[PDB]
Design a protein around this ligand. Structure first.
Ligand SMILES: C[C@H](CCC(=O)NCCC[N+](C)(C)CCCS(=O)(=O)[O-])[C@H]1CC[C@H]2[C@@H]3[C@H](O)C[C@@H]4C[C@H](O)CC[C@]4(C)[C@H]3C[C@H](O)[C@]12C
Ligand SMILES: C[C@H](CCC(=O)NCCC[N+](C)(C)CCCS(=O)(=O)[O-])[C@H]1CC[C@H]2[C@@H]3[C@H](O)C[C@@H]4C[C@H](O)CC[C@]4(C)[C@H]3C[C@H](O)[C@]12C
Ligand SMILES: C[C@H](CCC(=O)NCCC[N+](C)(C)CCCS(=O)(=O)[O-])[C@H]1CC[C@H]2[C@@H]3[C@H](O)C[C@@H]4C[C@H](O)CC[C@]4(C)[C@H]3C[C@H](O)[C@]12C
Ligand SMILES: C[C@H](CCC(=O)NCCC[N+](C)(C)CCCS(=O)(=O)[O-])[C@H]1CC[C@H]2[C@@H]3[C@H](O)C[C@@H]4C[C@H](O)CC[C@]4(C)[C@H]3C[C@H](O)[C@]12C
Ligand SMILES: C[C@H](CCC(=O)NCCC[N+](C)(C)CCCS(=O)(=O)[O-])[C@H]1CC[C@H]2[C@@H]3[C@H](O)C[C@@H]4C[C@H](O)CC[C@]4(C)[C@H]3C[C@H](O)[C@]12C
Ligand SMILES: C[C@H]1O[C@@H](n2cnc3c(N)ncnc32)[C@H](O)[C@@H]1O
Ligand code: MET
Ligand code: SF4
Ligand SMILES: [Cl-]
Ligand SMILES: [Cl-]
Ligand SMILES: [Cl-]
Length: 347
């Protein structure tokens, strides 16, 4: 199919493997710009001009897993490990709510210390503030997920990483794609708004793999989808591999919006790390969420999944104001409510 024909099929919602493969394979500037415009327009029509702010607190960099891409992997001895106290986390969340955050995201390595009861206690305290709570804590027993839902958690982010089971197992040697999917299905069954997503440009990953990621996301109809480029970290086995391509990653975000028009899709910090102004571009190519860093010093600089974190030198309270300025200069509006998914049922 020609570029024009692929665009027409996307507009008619003929989302075949063949159409998706061709969209990711064509490198023509004209085609790409038309794809981005289509995603931007679909975003505006379905989810409007509000950009939802999710304040993220990265509360522990301790991890029991050994994912090959991740700077927090357990084999990395070149890292000072930290744990925020429950009181520090709650009060940091309170400060974010004081600054206008309507969702608090708690993210960590897979750190056994907190699990499950300390998390439950923290979630309960933050829910009293009248905001949404999102957890992003990795893979845990169903019972832990159940306890956290009962404690009042609203959403769970668990990127599927890669839908190729062979590549998944190689990159995530403690676990499997089967496990990851089972966790995502459990989260959905328990009533969480559930987020998946993937990295683009992983070593060994192919275009067909990216197509499979898109089809996987469409199959399971996730509420949120987080996508970013792979960025090699020097203290990992993938230190010498190539970074993911920004434009290809942007096309994945655009296609995700086209496939899942009413989903919540962040402009991830990795997009802003690989290219100056990358988040702002992504917000104009299908994304409608932004996640300003709210991890305080001295811990922020110790939570580097990949190097070059854009907020690392900024003050503790800088990032919420910074994204509000961003939203205004983009001609957009901040979210007025918790920014939960607003499903538009269609055919
Ligand atoms: C129209 C004016 C003069 C020229 C001067 C610098 C040019 C931009 C830069 O080249 C970067 C980038 C390259 C891409 O290829 C196409 C998009 C983009 C944003 C260009 C657009 C345009 O062409 C610009 C604004
Ligand atoms: C600002 C620059 C340069 C415009 C220019 O200056 N040329 C005029 C009279 S003059 O005499 O200057 O020729 C233009 C050139 C191509 C444009 C992007 C593409 O569309 C793809 C995409 C579409 C989305 O929807 C919105 C986001 C995005 C990334 C666009 C943003 C912006 O819009 C760009 C960079
Ligand atoms: C935290 C401190 C002290 C007072 C306090 O503890 N304030 C709680 C407010 C709680 N809310 C955010 C829910 C109010 C919503 C009111 S609103 O009318 O916006 O719906 C207050 C005093 C002045 C406030 C800033 C300025 O204003 C400018 C700006 C407005 C944006 O918008 C949000 C960001 C920002 C930077 C503000 C953040 C924060 O807030 C500040 C620092
Ligand atoms: C100027 C920087 C390179 C900076 C650097 O690292 N030097 C390069 C790297 C990625 C490039 C963008 C992407 O291609 C997506 C998109 C394609 C459209 O066609 C034109 C607009 C847009 C936003 C591109 C503009 C520009 O070209 C970018 C920012
Ligand atoms: C306090 C800092 C400086 C400035 C920079 C951008 C400003 C925001 C934008 O103007 C959009 C909107 C009006 C209200 C809101 C969110 C503003 C709050 C505040 O005024 C901001 C955060
Ligand atoms: C929180 C999310 O961050 C992503 N993540 C972890 N390590 C890297 C890296 N080196 N490069 C880019 N993204 C990464 C994973 O996709 C994880 O799910
Ligand atoms: C810090 S990585 C993101 C949170 C969790 N460890 C996961 O891998 O899903
Ligand atoms: S990606 Fe999440 S589980 Fe894997 S090593 Fe990093 S922090 Fe641990
Ligand atoms: Cl969220
Ligand atoms: Cl995300
Ligand atoms: Cl990211």
């Amino acid at each position: 199919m020609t570029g024009r024909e692929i665009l027409e099929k996307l507009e008619r919602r003929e989302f075949t493997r063949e159409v998706l493969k061709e969209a990711l394979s064509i490198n023509d500037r004209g085609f790409n710009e038309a794809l981005f415009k289509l995603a931007d327009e679909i975003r505006r029509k379905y989810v409007g001009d509000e950009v939802h702010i999710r304040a993220i607190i990265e509360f522990s960099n301790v991890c029991r897993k050994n994912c090959l891409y991740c700077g927090l992997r357990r084999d990395n001895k070149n890292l000072k490990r930290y744990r925020m106290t429950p009181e520090e986390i709650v009060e940091r969340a309170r400060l974010a709510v004081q600054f206008g955050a309507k969702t608090i995201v708690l993210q960590s390595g897979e750190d056994p210390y907190x699990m499950p009861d300390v998390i439950s206690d923290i979630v309960k305290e933050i829910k009293k503030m009248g905001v949404a709570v999102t957890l992003s804590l990795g893979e845990w027993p169903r019972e832990y997920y159940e306890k956290w839902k009962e404690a009042g958690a609203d959403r769970y982010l668990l990127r599927h990483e890669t839908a190729n089971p062979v590549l998944h197992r190689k990159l995530r040697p403690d676990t499997s794609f089967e496990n990851r999917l089972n966790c995502l299905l459990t989260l959905k069954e328990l009533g969480y708004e559930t987020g998946a997503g993937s990295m683009v440009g992983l070593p060994g990953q192919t275009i067909d793999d990216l197509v499979d990621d898109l089809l996987f996301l469409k199959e399971h109809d996730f509420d949120m989808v987080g996508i970013g480029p792979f960025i090699p970290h020097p203290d990992t086995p993938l230190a010498n591999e190539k970074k993911g391509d920004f434009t290809l990653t942007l096309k994945m975000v655009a296609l995700t919006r086209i496939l899942l028009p009413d989903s919540n899709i962040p402009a991830t910090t990795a997009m802003g790390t690989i290219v100056p102004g990358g988040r702002e571009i992504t917000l104009r190519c299908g994304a409608n969420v932004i996640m300003p860093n709210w991890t305080p010093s001295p811990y922020r600089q110790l939570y580097q999944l990949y190097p070059g974190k854009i907020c690392v030198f900024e003050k503790d309270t800088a990032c919420i104001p910074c994204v509000m300025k961003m939203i205004e200069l983009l001609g957009r509006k901040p979210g007025r409510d918790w920014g939960g998914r607003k499903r538009v049922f269609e055919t």
